[PDB]
Structure 1
Amino acid sequence: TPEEKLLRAIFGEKASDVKDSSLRVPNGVSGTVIDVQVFTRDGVEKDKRALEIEEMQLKQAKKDLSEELQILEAGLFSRIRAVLVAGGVEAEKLDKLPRDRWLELGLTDEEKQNQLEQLAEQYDELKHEFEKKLEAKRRKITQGDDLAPGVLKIVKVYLAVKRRIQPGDKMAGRHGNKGVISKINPIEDMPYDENGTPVDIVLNPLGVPSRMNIGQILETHLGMAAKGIGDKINAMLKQQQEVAKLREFIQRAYDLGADVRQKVDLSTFSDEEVMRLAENLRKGMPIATPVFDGAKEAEIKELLKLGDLPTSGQIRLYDGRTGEQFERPVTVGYMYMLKLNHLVDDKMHARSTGSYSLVTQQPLGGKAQFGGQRFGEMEVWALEAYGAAYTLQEMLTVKSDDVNGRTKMYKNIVDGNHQMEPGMPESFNVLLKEIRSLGINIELED
């Protein structure tokens, strides 16, 4: 423009033609930048931050190899002190002199002076090895890297998102009980029992008799038995009880069965490990159940009898909303549930108007490419199966392919006039050019 060409006069530079524009990045994810790598093809000028990373890694590798030498030298001097306990020991004269000369003290030709000579060989090897390895590590940090044809420098940045949980993630147990988590309730609405504790997750019972995975209910009852033993340990430890009662109860919880393989006894743990073993058992007692030689029903019942839980595994549960009891007492316990990485803020996607493909003027495919969902062939059949005719016409002429049709559509939508000017799919013209590029003469009559 007159003023854009006048730039040279009023301000300076030259003329405003090349589009000044800084490569800015897109959205959808938060994070915290934890690690930045900068690789430089050799010959290119390192900028100030690449020299900052070079000084940083030089400093880290310098400190690390110096600590290798210091720590292994500390172990070597501890070996020298361990050898010189006998055979010409100096109890006071050992720490009067500097520590690097612990060899010329009074001691004859024995295995000990031979061992001090071997440790001197090791020490001088560590000295010259530290010299040559620090030189090689400065070479590895300082050098460039072979890279792609025609690239100056590569910057890699590591974002660290923390994804919590939300309605839409997929959780599942270990038996095939899948499920999209559907509502994240408050604490108060949960069914609680006549102790006070709310249950965390409410599954659905109807998945059990059809999908025949009856193992999850035995896993639930045995998990409640394990947590009953853990609650009794927490009760016997929170009251600051001496180690005798803890030894009694842990021994009763570890015998408990038929002819089994475990057969432990706590009489060889010596009153300090038992407190730390109970510090590790207070959040529950882990139970092994091998695959086809597992815990039968009567053993689960006898372990639910050791805790003061009900025998059938079912506690009566109150309601959170009404505050009145559920009839016919329900099954609670602990199930070990897994979060799967089919999350919901990796599948969710939406597109009004994005980019368009090049050879056939249709939208791109995928999520990383900001794309639209494939209105496939069977959906075209399902709209022929109704009487929906205008919905299919805009579903494959206006919304998808015809470029003048969709710019007329976008103007008509932002002006309030819901109306389509149909036109022709441009990919049908591509079909005409591909059939016509053979010896075939396809046309459009009239």
Structure 2
Amino acid sequence: MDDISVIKNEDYEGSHRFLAEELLMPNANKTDGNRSTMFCSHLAQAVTLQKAEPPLVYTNFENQVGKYSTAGYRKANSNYKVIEKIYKNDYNYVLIVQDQETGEYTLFERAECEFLTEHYGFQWDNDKIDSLKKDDTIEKDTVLYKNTCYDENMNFGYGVNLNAAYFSYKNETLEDAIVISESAAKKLGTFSVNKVKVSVNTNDILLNLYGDNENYKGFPDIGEHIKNQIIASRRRFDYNTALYELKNLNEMRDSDTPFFADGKIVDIEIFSNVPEEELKVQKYNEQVLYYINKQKEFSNNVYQKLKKIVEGKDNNVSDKLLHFYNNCKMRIDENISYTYQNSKFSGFIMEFTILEEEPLNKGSKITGRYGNKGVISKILPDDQMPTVAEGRFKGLKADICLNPLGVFNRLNPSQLIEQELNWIAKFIRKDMEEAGSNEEKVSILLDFLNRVNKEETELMEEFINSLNKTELEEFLNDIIENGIPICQKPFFGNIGLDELWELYNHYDHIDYFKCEGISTPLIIGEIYMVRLKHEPHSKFSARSTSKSKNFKEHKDLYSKTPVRIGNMEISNLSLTNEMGSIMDMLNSYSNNETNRRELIMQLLTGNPFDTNIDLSDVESGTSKILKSLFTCLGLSIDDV
């Protein structure tokens, strides 16, 4: 509506009720709406980080976001007791438990990775569930497995804190470009999990890519990483009766279908529609047989253990346990014909689950909570980055360097406030470390926090007075070395121009850092940084003459989708006023098959370092078909 007089600030004062995703953004009143909406987009585009940290400057709603976003953690919902543990793989296993109140029998599943979509996934901290053994009670709110986002006390982190300085690094930090320390890039690490299906029919066999002559292994094992980005390759045969192609195991050909991924496979699920005796005779199936047997061994194992509970009259089983039991029973049961896409399939279909630690690489996009964007232009050694010299903070190196030009134009001032607060906090930490008793340290801490956030100061006084002297010393050391928590609420409770002004006036010793080779003094302060989903790999295309969807089906390493030339492109090329060469490129590259063959042949038969191509003048195949059909139509072109 036009009327905004209805909005009265006194009504919404002290409440963040009007904020949603921006509850994760400090000093949101100071950031523009455009930057805020970009931040909201980035949070969904954010990728999981192995070494995620709770933000140094926090809004205090982050833990709630971790709590109510259930995809990252598994919490027991009742008191349980561990009946038994069954293993399918070293990495994948199931735990059967009984409700201590209902008596219902339920199960919990353990796996290394969680697959979300495409390549996106994350590894699990499975410490607690792995600790559990038979006849061990699971308390009501225990967390069996957690994501890397959550910590020991279930604090939530979507990014890492990196020391940042606004500096013009050899023009590498141009526009939204960033230079990162190699150690810092190690901190910003993601996982990639892929579920890849290879379908081998009766006439297809898998080449011995991972095996010797004595032992035939055509695909990686559960504990082995993929080599050369090839899981397996299938050769289709016209008739598998001869079995003469035993000698062909090592070689590869273009006709063979190759399946591409990199990482450690962690689970194999095989769906077989072939009788066991038919499979056993051939040695080339040996590896497959093992996993098939293993699956059956797992399934049978659950069936024997749970048959009394499920098929007993009481049937105090959860629906999950019932369906798991039924599926395993179907697997062991004969006359089980597996159908994929509503059709019965020959041979077997294998699903590999592959987990890879994907590191930060050039072209990756990283951001802060304030809508800024950055692309990693260069990763440089720690020594090459700005390092302050001849101070109490001597040898401190900046993890990331950001563009100073245009910072105010972005209309997201809050990133600077985060930097200033962590930088001033460094001085407070050194002041605590340098001198005093524990009481002096808490006094300095409480004064600084009183300057920043009164609520944090009050709660910290309570928390500190609660602590024992040993615990107090440990907490103080944690603050000195790891960092200091500072609370900057989104709208109500953040500091401003006047408060930072007072902070700078009181702390006269705090002044810019003098770096080693830099004339201009610099400020180095920690900023919270997040890793975005975009990487160059998504849009890479490269094509050489002989969508296909093979790449989506993992049959091609990279997309070979052709680029399109149109009338606009032809006009811009026609600027040269040499139309014949443009037509030659079009015919040699696309339209004319004869000229295309000539180009390929000449490129491979001519001198490597001197290439001159002569193309024959011939009507294209499309033109020939057009003339033939038109003459049948009864109309003929007169070169009008």
Residues 273 and 405 of structure 1: CA distance in aligned 2, closer, same or farther (over 3 Å): same
Greater share of strand = 2
CA offsets per residue over residues 110-157 of structure 1, 9 Å max, x none? xxxxxxxxxxxxxxx999748x99897554213145533131432111
Residues 181 and 309 of structure 1: CA distance in aligned 2, closer, same or farther (over 3 Å): farther
Q: CA deviation at 1:184?
A: 1.6
Q: Please say if residues 595 and 615 of structure 2, whose CA atoms lie closer than 8 Å, have aligned partners that are also in contact.
A: yes
| Alignment-derived partner of residue 381 in structure 1 | 571
| Alignment-derived partner of residue 264 in structure 2 | 32
> 2:476 & 2:527 partners in 1: Cα distance?
22
1:267 equivalent to 2:459? Answer no
Residues 304 and 354 of structure 1: CA distance in aligned 2, closer, same or farther (over 3 Å): farther
| Alignment-derived partner of residue 408 in structure 1 | 598
Match of 2:340 among 126, 131, 147: 147
SS of the counterpart of 1:399?
A: helix
CA offsets per residue over residues 182-208 of structure 1, 9 Å max, x none? 222222222211211221222211122
Q: CA deviation at 1:438?
A: 12
1:219 equivalent to 2:409? Answer no
| Alignment-derived partner of residue 490 in structure 2 | 291
Letter of the 1:341 partner, please give it.
K
SS of the counterpart of 1:143?
A: helix
Match of 1:349 among 541, 552, 555: 541
Residues 211 and 415 of structure 1: CA distance in aligned 2, closer, same or farther (over 3 Å): same
| Alignment-derived partner of residue 56 in structure 1 | 298
Q: What TM-score results when the alignment is normalised by the length of structure 2?
A: 0.46
> 1:48 & 1:168 partners in 2: Cα distance?
42
CA offsets per residue over residues 12-39 of structure 1, 9 Å max, x none? 94999xx998954155x53221221123
Match of 2:513 among 311, 315, 318: 315
Greater share of helix = 1
> 1:289 & 1:406 partners in 2: Cα distance?
64
Q: Please say if residues 172 and 339 of structure 1, whose CA atoms lie closer than 8 Å, have aligned partners that are also in contact.
A: yes
Letter of the 2:545 partner, please give it.
T
Match of 1:164 among 356, 359, 384: 359
Q: CA deviation at 1:399?
A: 0.5
Residues 59 and 245 of structure 1: CA distance in aligned 2, closer, same or farther (over 3 Å): farther
Q: Please say if residues 397 and 424 of structure 1, whose CA atoms lie closer than 8 Å, have aligned partners that are also in contact.
A: no
SS of the counterpart of 1:338?
A: strand
Q: CA deviation at 1:216?
A: 2.2
Percent identity among equivalent residues? 22
Q: CA deviation at 1:279?
A: 5.9
Unaligned runs of 5+ in 2: 1-240, 280-288, 332-337, 550-555, 607-611
SS of the counterpart of 1:220?
A: helix
Alignment of 1:323-362 (within 5 A): 326-354=518-546
Residues 335 and 378 of structure 1: CA distance in aligned 2, closer, same or farther (over 3 Å): farther
Q: Please say if residues 428 and 444 of structure 2, whose CA atoms lie closer than 8 Å, have aligned partners that are also in contact.
A: no
Letter of the 1:337 partner, please give it.
M
Q: Please say if residues 514 and 521 of structure 2, whose CA atoms lie closer than 8 Å, have aligned partners that are also in contact.
A: yes
| Alignment-derived partner of residue 447 in structure 2 | 252
Q: Please say if residues 253 and 306 of structure 1, whose CA atoms lie closer than 8 Å, have aligned partners that are also in contact.
A: no
Residues 442 and 44 of structure 1: CA distance in aligned 2, closer, same or farther (over 3 Å): farther
| Alignment-derived partner of residue 443 in structure 1 | 637
> 2:441 & 2:458 partners in 1: Cα distance?
18
Q: CA deviation at 1:353?
A: 2.0
Q: CA deviation at 1:347?
A: 3.1
Q: Please say if residues 591 and 620 of structure 2, whose CA atoms lie closer than 8 Å, have aligned partners that are also in contact.
A: yes
Q: Please say if residues 397 and 422 of structure 1, whose CA atoms lie closer than 8 Å, have aligned partners that are also in contact.
A: no
* Structure with bigger RCO (C-alpha 8 Å, 6+ apart): 2
Q: Please say if residues 424 and 510 of structure 2, whose CA atoms lie closer than 8 Å, have aligned partners that are also in contact.
A: no
Q: Please say if residues 364 and 375 of structure 2, whose CA atoms lie closer than 8 Å, have aligned partners that are also in contact.
A: yes
Letter of the 2:637 partner, please give it.
E
Residues 256 and 317 of structure 1: CA distance in aligned 2, closer, same or farther (over 3 Å): same
SS of the counterpart of 2:267?
A: strand
SS of the counterpart of 2:540?
A: coil
Letter of the 2:562 partner, please give it.
G
SS of the counterpart of 1:184?
A: strand
Q: Please say if residues 229 and 284 of structure 1, whose CA atoms lie closer than 8 Å, have aligned partners that are also in contact.
A: no
Letter of the 2:370 partner, please give it.
H
> 2:568 & 2:258 partners in 1: Cα distance?
37
The count of aligned residue pairs is 352
Residues 432 and 387 of structure 1: CA distance in aligned 2, closer, same or farther (over 3 Å): same
Q: CA deviation at 1:247?
A: 3.9
> 1:165 & 1:330 partners in 2: Cα distance?
26
> 1:335 & 1:61 partners in 2: Cα distance?
54
> 1:200 & 1:295 partners in 2: Cα distance?
25
Letter of the 1:404 partner, please give it.
T
**Which protein shows a greater Rg?**
1
